[PDB]
Subunit: 199 residues, 4 copies
């Protein structure tokens, strides 16, 4: 079982004018493609190392596995979090959980925006689900470090704040990108990840 | 004594076609300007905190100080490392030190290139001077973490590999940026930092 | 400011047989004492660096300030968290907050124990208060990194799991130390810190 | 592979009075033993994760693999670095390499001592070999992070400065432990590791 680059559920230009086709094409077809290939390359090296019990080689490979493995996980989620039919507000139990845990939908937007803009360097802003406490929680992750593997939280909604995610369009003004991305959020997908946690 | 944004020693377009004016203008007039202002803001908060002995406030501010303080230091060095009259190879004692410590000028280029391309996320590649051992040394730093404050090495030549340093021109192909930047290296300035370490 | 080593609120042997007098004496009069002395030394150097605008020197000092500064913060709270009159269970609003957020007092005990035993290397287990969410939260911190300065949580109860906190008595068996320490928790102080977080 | 706890090359009390038998026995039969058992447990979980392509699970396991894996690597070298027949100074090519790279044996001793005493929290001091530059190098590592896996340096001589390595005998006075340990260094083994690095 090899990992593969998933096809995008929409055309590269489907999110215009909020995210233009050139960013989407570069972000998906160059960046994500590289993470999955290097993940596959890295897993073969680690697979060899684990069989020989070469702990030094296993440990030397951990950054490459985390970096490329996280990149694959994160972008694969990210594409599903966006939709040309998205935007607006969530409904039903997710909306009620957000009001419950954050006060209002607007306060949640403020807190996730603040977490994303506050990332020093490259990283991600997340809405996550805390299985232990049974409530929603906002977290930020550096580089391509994935949410669940490093915090235990189930990822619901991720915001890529790597400069390659917005720079061609918004240059250094990260707040403009965060403002625009709310217009294409696929709350149906966010809701489906959330409902899968509860039973 | 307040920190200030230094003027560039050349026109925004002086490094064309290797680095185009739009990157230089954005990199200097937006990014660097923000680091120095936030550094000044952060120092006032810390200056208050240190007077009251509020250790919690001092510690809470450390990331902001390191991030914005490093950004100011790094870019201020970076501008001097580039020149429209640069490129080529160094001469004199610096050239001899490089052959001595790295084998050849081309091997040094390979090693600094590899360190820079290998940065996962945002960071810097450096040629530094090890005062303790008295030789040259290559190091990589994450985000805006400055070389001397965190490693003890004296910075000689820095390569900004933040995506805002190349993405508008070279997109995701960081190796193309590293190849081009060798054409505008100010070896005179690199030499002057190096000679200041020796006595 | 010139920080000072606080006097202990009890005799070094007051917690026997749960924590023996030699640990308390070494932990207070040698270990804590060293952090205070080095904190004062570190703060003096930092004040000079800030006056000259030496950003490099400020950044070089951050590990010593956080480590020794945190050590002072952490132990000063820790001593107030213990009492020969301690142990048992809390009452009133703190007990109700624990039931709300953790289910029961026993489950809180199990989770804080797990957080403390799970620390890899040197560090601390904490019960803290999250002002943003208005609930209790368990956290672990590495080395002497202090809870509030690095996480924003208000410390209520801290467990030092540096080996110097137990090794003379409990050797490598950290669970025995954790089981014993519940017997000397000053729940009256934990209650006062919690009430101070509320309006 | 199924890693195993290595037999000690000497009696637990063979290094008295420099390192007492109780530390050696606890350090070998409890501390090292725990790393091996948890390493085998951790490797089994990782093999399953790799088979299912569960990248999240692979990443969640990295801290346990590095910590317990490094603990096995580090202590296995450490035991071979000590000998009742040890102490004194090295001879031959190792002694000459030290003079070349550090000036004198005494200065090497001062610097490795400083590197070991300067570790904040748990960790190790190392003399290592840098294959790239072809010279000796002093490094410190946190917790059980292993030298070669995280830095690329070949370990020659390691100093465990976890408190469990000295506290029963030397209490908080790490310099006394460091001064004493020179008396039991197996320079014959250090020499064999160094020669193995050369062609
Ligand atoms: Mn991305
Ligand atoms: Mn830059
Ligand atoms: Mn302590
Ligand atoms: Mn040990």
């Amino acid at each position: 079982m090899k990992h593969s680059l998933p096809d995008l559920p929409y055309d590269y230009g489907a999110l215009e004018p909020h995210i233009n086709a050139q960013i989407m094409q570069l972000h998906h077809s160059k960046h994500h493609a590289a993470y999955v290939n290097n993940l596959n390359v890295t897993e073969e090296k680690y697979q060899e190392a684990l069989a020989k019990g070469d702990v030094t080689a296993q440990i030397a490979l951990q950054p490459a596995l985390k970096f490329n493995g996280g990149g694959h996980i994160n972008h694969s989620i990210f594409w599903t979090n966006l939709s040309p039919n998205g935007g607006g507000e969530p409904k039903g139990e997710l909306l009620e959980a957000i009001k419950r845990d954050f006060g209002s939908f607007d306060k949640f937007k403020e807190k996730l925006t603040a977490a994303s803009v506050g990332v020093q360097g490259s990283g991600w802003g997340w809405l996550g689900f805390n299985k232990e406490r049974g409530h929603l929680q906002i977290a930020a992750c550096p580089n391509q470090d994935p949410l669940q593997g490093t915090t235990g939280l189930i990822p619901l909604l991720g915001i890529d704040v790597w400069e390659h995610a917005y720079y061609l369009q918004y240059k250094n003004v990260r707040p403009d990108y965060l403002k625009a991305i709310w217009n294409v959020i696929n709350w149906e997908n966010v809701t489906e990840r959330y409902m899968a946690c509860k039973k």
